[PDB]
Amino acid sequence: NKGWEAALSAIEMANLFKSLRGTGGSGSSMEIYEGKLTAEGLRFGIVASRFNHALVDRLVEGAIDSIVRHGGREEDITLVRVPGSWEIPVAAGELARKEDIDAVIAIGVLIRGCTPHFDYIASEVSKGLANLSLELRKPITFGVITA
Amino acid sequence: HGNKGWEAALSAIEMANLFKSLRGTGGSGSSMEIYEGKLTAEGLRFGIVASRFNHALVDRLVEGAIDSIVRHGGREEDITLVRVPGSWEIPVAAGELARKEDIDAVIAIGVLIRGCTPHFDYIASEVSKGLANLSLELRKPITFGVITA
Amino acid sequence: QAIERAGTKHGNKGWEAALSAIEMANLFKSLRGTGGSGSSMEIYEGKLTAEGLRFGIVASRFNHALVDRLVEGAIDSIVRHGGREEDITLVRVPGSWEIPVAAGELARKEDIDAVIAIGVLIRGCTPHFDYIASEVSKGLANLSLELRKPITFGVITA
Amino acid sequence: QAIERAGTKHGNKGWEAALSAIEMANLFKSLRGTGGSGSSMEIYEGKLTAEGLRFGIVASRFNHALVDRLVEGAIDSIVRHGGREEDITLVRVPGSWEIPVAAGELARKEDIDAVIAIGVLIRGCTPHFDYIASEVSKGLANLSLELRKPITFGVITA
Amino acid sequence: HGNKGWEAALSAIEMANLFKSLRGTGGSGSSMEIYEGKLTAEGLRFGIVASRFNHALVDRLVEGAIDSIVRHGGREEDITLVRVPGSWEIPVAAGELARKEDIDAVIAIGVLIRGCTPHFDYIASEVSKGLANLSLELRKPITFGVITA
Amino acid sequence: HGNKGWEAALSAIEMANLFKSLRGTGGSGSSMEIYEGKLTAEGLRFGIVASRFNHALVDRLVEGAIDSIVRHGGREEDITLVRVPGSWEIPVAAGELARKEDIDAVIAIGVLIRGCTPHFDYIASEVSKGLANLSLELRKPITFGVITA
Amino acid sequence: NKGWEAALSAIEMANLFKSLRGTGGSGSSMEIYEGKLTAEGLRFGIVASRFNHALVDRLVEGAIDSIVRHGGREEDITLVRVPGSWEIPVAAGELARKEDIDAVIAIGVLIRGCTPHFDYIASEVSKGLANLSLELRKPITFGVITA
């Protein structure tokens, strides 16, 4: 279930960035920065599409379960629904600019298989999410699948 | 001694020296100027970003990178190592290290899932593109030690 | 050594790349100048006189045999068209991946009128999409538009 | 490091090569011994007990990932069949071309009962005749016949 | 009667007799000398070297070899059978048998992988080469009963 | 710094050291012995054999070989250079150098005429075979710096 | 004309080996051994086949002309004819064991083209000549062609 995996990646970036922005080490050894798998005290945001209802519900199911099971507090989740995959990047941008969220998770299902004639919509969705993460300096996990 | 981790470190060391020369005082003229970087790692600060897929392989590349830096005069106390889950999200971590003024170069190490070979994958395209844009924007070398399974 | 010098280098991609840089450098210098009075359609084209211009060259070291013939091709194009060898800056980089970042540093100097990028690319013996080759073209194109200074593309496939 | 140790290496070409060396070493030791009394057809076969035998291994360094799993496969085959780790001599060489000459030096020692050669070969993506691969096979075969000591062939193609 | 093991045994018997006659002093003259070997195995010692790989087929080949020797007057007491792991080490074992002064001929039996090679095979070429060189150096007949799958 | 001339010199230097270790006194035991050669060229004597076809290319490889030896501690006075017309006749010249007791290794450099590609050429086969036999017979490293056009 | 080229290679090995066996240098610089293109005072031997009479005569023509033109003395050439290419190695062996010859030249024409099904006779001729040169430590030039 990609939903469980995508949530796990987000948890362990919210911890990593929290460590990096903190005070540095004492020197005298090679600094190593790391992210644990404890979600206590963290705020998340989820953006999910509405296409292939059967599949997406299972994915959003895993994401919420993963956050709570790893110690998260269910009141710290904001869920946003959008008509289709083309509208995920713009919604994620709005949710990522709030100062109360630490990571964002994108859930969706693409239409054509793994052997198309190339897909423009799929490229734009992945391309847009990547630029937002770099521009806003905030992790954004990528949890879409292919039909 | 011949792994991609070793090679990536050399390119990072050399480019770091070359940039230090370019923005220094120019030559006296009267002849064609030639700029090239040395392989003296003394006084340089490095950061490394490594993924986690294939824990066996990635550990090997990271060890090679550290070995290369120290053998060429690098001080082991000047290496910052950041570890990340997958290849999709090296660029965001690399960006954080590059924006520090105490880092002279960044090395990215990872392994990609070889999917359907003839066709176009989106994770590989985004990881390479993101690193390239960061280097041009921040004006700082970023080496691409990535490989394929 | 004399055997190396005896070979001809007119016409290789180093020659064409340098020639394009000379024309573009003169063309821009004309555009920034005062506009014509009018009374007719006004045409612009760059002359091929290279005296007084400053050039920069970025070349990778991979495949040390092919590259050298390309770099020497570029230099002779500038010299044979009137340029002086004292107005050329040469920068060498480990590989094709880091050409764009080095080319950016040269292009930001106010003493450079154009930049020439030379290199070679490894061709896998089956036609897949190369993630390194695309980044070089993408990076160089962006730099020229942003800095508003011509940059010429002089790479080849093995 | 523990991740490396957890992997299984039973059955790789390092395993088979070592196993053949053990059998041949015992077989020769039987042939040199006194012949049977007679009265029936007399059969020889080598046992798989490795206690008391000395072994030598020659391995190239090209493709450092593949080779290590092969060398460790050979060592565990000797140990798991009764051999001691103090009776193994390991020699490392730059490349596959100089395996035969190094293997010759080890084979001439009187304290060695068998030699194992391990390496990998580069496969060009079109099937031509390889002048390096043939020389390794030719050299190793000649050494065994001339020195009258078994040598086992444990190379693979990439 | 129809397997290569049977044929290999007959060749070994005939060559062993032929060598026995050649060492004899030449004739008086008055005609053209003709030398040939007979097919009686009485009083001759043989050795067999067989590989274990693809054992389903070789047992039938070794079967024929022993059957032929006995059928043609050979005493089963005089056969020495040696087994080796694979075909790569047939030559080295054959050399040890051929150097015994109590052996008149040696028979080598084995099976090689499919012969649809691009241009060449590097293991098959060594078995035949080694046996041929060994026979000439030691001046003793060695028969090739190897077949291709 | 990355030409076949450079690589061939390294292999010659390393193998020369390794042989010096093997025939010296053995270890104390109680642990597995590992033998490997260093990259210290001090005190070693080298000979080089170079063909003449493509004078431009061969000169480059020969310069690289000399540069590699000296940079790793080699004394320029300990290099003997022999030049020959074509590839067919490197082995006979290499044999003469190898038989001197003052030479520790030999390096062979040349370029072959790429004929009809898929098929078998006899000049290339003989040059490689001859070098291999010489090393085994004389028990001395001989490196193969040869390339193809 | 391969005949001219084959003779030239032999001339400049008889000189090289003459230099190598001579006294060494004075040190203080990198020893370089070299062979000139002067054939004065040298003895040669030629072994030629008798198949494709038209072609071989032209090749033996060039070899003798090359030796004399580069200063050789025509009385110092020994010519041996053999029925076919298969008999070249054995004849060359006899001529190379004499102590009065400095180099040997082999001239011949092979039968099948450059794209056969592999040729056993061609391989043996080249293989045999190479072994003789190494075993006897004396240059032997290879001047055959393919029909």
Residue in chain B closest to D1 (alpha carbons) equals: B56
- Name the residue with tokens 């190592």: B81
β strands within chain B, DSSP E: 33-35, 46-50, 79-83, 105-109, 111-112, 142-144, 147-148
Q: Which of C10, C64, C81, C128 is catalytic?
A: C128
CA distance B127 to B49: 13
Which chain D residues contact residue C126 at CB under 8 A? 125
Method: cryo-EM
Question: Which is nearest to F88 in space by CA: F3, F146, F29?
Answer: F146
Residue F8 near residue F107, CB atoms below 8 Å = yes
Q: Which residues pair with F48 in a beta bridge?
A: F81, F107
Q: What is the DSSP letter of E85?
A: S
CA distance F132 to F91: 9
Total residue count of chain C as it appears in this document: 158
Residue B53 near residue B127, CB atoms below 8 Å = no
D124 interfaces chain F, CB cutoff of 8 Å: no
Question: Is G16 in contact with F82 (Cβ distance < 8 A)?
Answer: yes
Backbone angles phi, psi at A47, to 5 degrees: -120, 120
- Across the interface, of G27, G134, G137, the residue whose CB is closest to F77 is G27
At F56, is the secondary structure helix, strand, or coil? helix
Residue C73 near residue C12, CB atoms below 8 Å = yes
Please list the alpha-helical segments (H only) found in E23-144. Answer: 55-71, 90-98, 124-138
Q: Which residues contact C32 (CB under 8 A, 6 or more apart)?
A: none
Residue in chain F closest to C6 (alpha carbons) equals: F56
Q: What is the DSSP string of chain A?
A: -HHHHHHHHHHHHHHHHHHHTS----SSS-EEE---S--TT--EEEEE--SSHHHHHHHHHHHHHHHHHTT--GGGEEEEE-SSGGGHHHHHHHHHTSTT-SEEEEEEEESS-SS-S--HHHHHHHHHHHHHHHHHT--EEEEEEE-
Query: What is the enclosing helix (H) or strand (E) of D18?
Result: helix D13-31
In one-letter notation, the amino acid at residue C60 is S
Token pair recorded at residue G42: 């040298």
In one-letter notation, the amino acid at residue C145 is L
CA distance to partner chain B, nearest, from residue A54 (Å): 25
Residue D116 near residue D80, CB atoms below 8 Å = no
Residue B67 near residue B46, CB atoms below 8 Å = no
**Between residues 137 and 156 of chain C, which touch chain B (CB distance below 8 Å)?**
138-139, 142-143
Q: Which residues pair with A47 in a beta bridge?
A: A80, A106
Token pair recorded at residue C155: 């790479």
Question: Which is nearest to F6 in space by CA: B38, B68, C122, D94?
Answer: D94
Angle subtended at Cα B7 by Cα F71 and Cα A34, rounded to the nearest 5 degrees: 135
Residue G55 near residue G105, CB atoms below 8 Å = no
Q: Which residues contact D46 (CB under 8 A, 6 or more apart)?
A: D22, D23, D24, D25, D26, D27, D30
- Chains touching C (3+ CB pairs < 8 Å): B, D, F
Q: Which residues contact F71 (CB under 8 A, 6 or more apart)?
A: none
- Across the interface, of B77, B84, B134, the residue whose CB is closest to A28 is B77
Backbone angles phi, psi at B79, to 5 degrees: -115, 125
CA distance A50 to A48: 7
Handedness of CA C96, C97, C98, C100 (dihedral sign): positive
Residue F50 near residue F17, CB atoms below 8 Å = no
- Across the interface, of F92, F120, F133, the residue whose CB is closest to G118 is F120
Do E and B make contact, counting contact as 3+ CB pairs within 8 angstroms? no
Q: What is the DSSP string of F24-40?
A: S-----SS-EEE-----
F34 interfaces chain C, CB cutoff of 8 Å: no
Residue G10 near residue G141, CB atoms below 8 Å = yes
Residue G147 near residue G109, CB atoms below 8 Å = yes
In one-letter notation, the amino acid at residue C76 is D
Query: What is the enclosing helix (H) or strand (E) of C146?
Result: helix C131-147
Token pair recorded at residue C108: 């930001």
CA distance to partner chain D, nearest, from residue E31 (Å): 43
Backbone angles phi, psi at A59, to 5 degrees: -70, -45
CA distance to partner chain F, nearest, from residue D87 (Å): 7
Please give the torsion angle defined by the CA atoms of residues D99, D101, D104 and D109, in that order, rounded to the nearest 10 degrees. -100
Which chain A residues contact residue B77 at CB under 8 A? 27-30
Q: Which residues contact E136 (CB under 8 A, 6 or more apart)?
A: none
At F148, is the secondary structure helix, strand, or coil? strand
Measured CA to CA in angstroms, residue C45 lies from C17, C53, C153, G51 at distances of 17, 17, 20, 69
Measured CA to CA in angstroms, residue A121 lies from A110, A125, C129 at distances of 9, 6, 19
Q: What is the DSSP string of chain G?
A: -HHHHHHHHHHHHHHHHHHHTS----SSS-EEE---S--TT--EEEEE--SSHHHHHHHHHHHHHHHHHTT--GGGEEEEE-SSGGGHHHHHHHHHTSTT-SEEEEEEEESS-SS-S--HHHHHHHHHHHHHHHHHT--EEEEEEE-
CA distance E72 to E39: 7
**Between residues 84 and 123 of chain F, which touch chain G (CB distance below 8 Å)?**
84-86, 88-89, 91-93, 95-96, 115-116, 119-120, 122-123
Question: Is F91 in contact with G122 (Cβ distance < 8 A)?
Answer: no
In one-letter notation, the amino acid at residue C113 is D
Token pair recorded at residue B144: 């691409």
β strands within chain C, DSSP E: 55-60, 88-93, 114-121, 151-157
For A32-65, the three-class secondary structure string (H helix, E strand, C coil) is EECCCCCCCCCCEEEEECCCCHHHHHHHHHHHHH
Which chain D residues contact residue F129 at CB under 8 A? 135, 138
Measured CA to CA in angstroms, residue G108 lies from C117, F87, G55, G97 at distances of 53, 20, 9, 21
In one-letter notation, the amino acid at residue C10 is H
Residue A57 CA, distance from chain mean position: 16
Q: What is the resolution of the experimental data for this entry, in Å?
A: 2.4
Residue B112 near residue B123, CB atoms below 8 Å = yes
> Which of F6, F52, F54, F60 to probe the C interface (max C CBs under 10 A)?
F60
Residue B13 near residue B105, CB atoms below 8 Å = yes
**B135 C-beta neighbours (distance < 10 Å), count:** 24
Token pair recorded at residue E32: 């053209």
G22 interfaces chain F, CB cutoff of 8 Å: no
Question: Is F130 in contact with G127 (Cβ distance < 8 A)?
Answer: no
Residue F130 near residue F89, CB atoms below 8 Å = no
Exposure string (b/e) for A36-71, b if CB count within 10 Å is 16 or more? eeebeebbbbbbbbebbeebbeebbebbbebbeebe
Question: Is B128 in contact with C129 (Cβ distance < 8 A)?
Answer: no
Total residue count of chain G as it appears in this document: 147
Question: Which is nearest to D87 in space by CA: D95, D78, D96?
Answer: D78
Residue F109 near residue F62, CB atoms below 8 Å = yes
CA distance E18 to A48: 90
